[PDB]
């Protein structure tokens, strides 16, 4: 067949398998790319925490956490703890427009993990709560 960019809906039967596992079963890599930090947490299909890493947990301080090298370092630290539990294929769910939004995705690949999808779950309200006032800096 051809190749579609839309994810295979669970209900309808498909033929796309990864290591004999359906798309639903693949573990999920929740990335929260903030402006001053980047936390990464890998979970299974049944929401079971397997690995957690962040720039702070890798020995970075203050303004070094909001860089692209600290997010990549955090991906290698989470892709090395989850590869010992039998994780190879993951579903990336990026949340945030921070510096370590794409650099953490590269770090997960530098740990032996293969990314099959890229999901964006950045919080966008349909007017809800009021942000802080604009600054003059």
């Amino acid at each position: 067949t051809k190749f579609s960019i839309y994810p295979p809906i669970p209900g309808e039967e498909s033929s796309l398998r990864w290591a004999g596992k359906k798309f639903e079963e693949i573990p999920i890599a929740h990335i929260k790319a903030s402006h001053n930090n980047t936390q990464i947490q890998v979970v299974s299909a049944s929401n079971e925490p397997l690995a957690f890493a962040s720039c702070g947990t890798e020995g970075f301080r203050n303004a070094k956490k909001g860089t692209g090298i600290a997010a990549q370092t955090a991906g290698i630290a989470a892709a090395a703890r989850a590869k010992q539990k039998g994780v190879i294929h993951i579903r990336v769910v990026v949340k945030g427009l921070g510096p370590g939004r794409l650099s953490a995705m590269h770090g997960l690949i530098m740990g032996g993990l293969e990314v099959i999808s890229i999901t964006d779950n950045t919080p966008i309200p349909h007017n809800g709560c009021r942000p802080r006032k604009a600054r003059k800096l």
Binding site: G56, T57, E58, T73
Partner: protein, 191 residues
């Protein structure tokens, strides 16, 4: 300013005096050999004492890294020891108007009440000839407003070949205060 958090897998110094999680002294070992123990037992290294010339690092579990600082959050709360003194500066002019001298004299009263150090400097007024007789009479005029609260730390000096005078003020020390108090009572009550 430091925190009891893991340093990570990046060590600056090649030789470290590693310490066991249970407090056993592993002994000095190569930097590469330190990371092997962080994976073999999945433990994080924290620098216990920077001051010592030989690098000292202790590897403990994440729960052990939380309990440590969780006690440093109480020791400082129970017995806080913050003694740094901020230093403030003022640069006046001999011909400074009284109104501006009363506003700047009230600013010094807030600094002396917060146990700050006030560096006061006086300069020759614009196109004004004056000696150090009335140029040094402003310190005595400022200190008089604070009789007991403030006292000289340093004394007027010719910082810049005599054109300018610099002095430092401080909040009166507890002991000194008591002495001032004691003296005040005798003058009026005994009479």
């Amino acid at each position: 300013k430091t925190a009891f958090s893991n340093v990570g897998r990046k060590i600056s110094q090649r030789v470290i005096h590693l310490f066991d999680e249970k407090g056993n002294d592993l002994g000095n070992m190569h930097r590469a050999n330190v990371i092997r123990l962080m994976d073999e037992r999945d433990l994080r290294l924290v620098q216990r004492n920077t001051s010592t010339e030989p690098a000292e690092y202790q590897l403990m579990t994440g729960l052990q890294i939380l309990q440590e600082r969780q006690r440093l959050r109480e020791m400082e709360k129970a017995n806080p020891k913050t003694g740094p003194t901020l230093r403030k500066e003022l640069i006046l002019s001999s011909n400074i108007g009284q109104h501006d001298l009363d506003t700047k004299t009230k600013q010094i009263q807030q600094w002396i009440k917060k146990k700050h150090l006030v560096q006061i400097t006086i300069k020759k007024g614009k196109n004004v000839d004056v000696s150090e007789n009335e140029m040094e009479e402003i310190f005595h005029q400022i200190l008089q407003t604070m009789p007991g609260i403030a006292t000289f730390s340093s004394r007027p000096q010719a910082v810049q070949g005599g054109k300018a005078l610099m002095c430092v003020l401080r909040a009166l020390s507890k002991n000194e205060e008591k002495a001032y108090k004691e003296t005040q009572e005798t003058q009026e009550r005994d009479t």
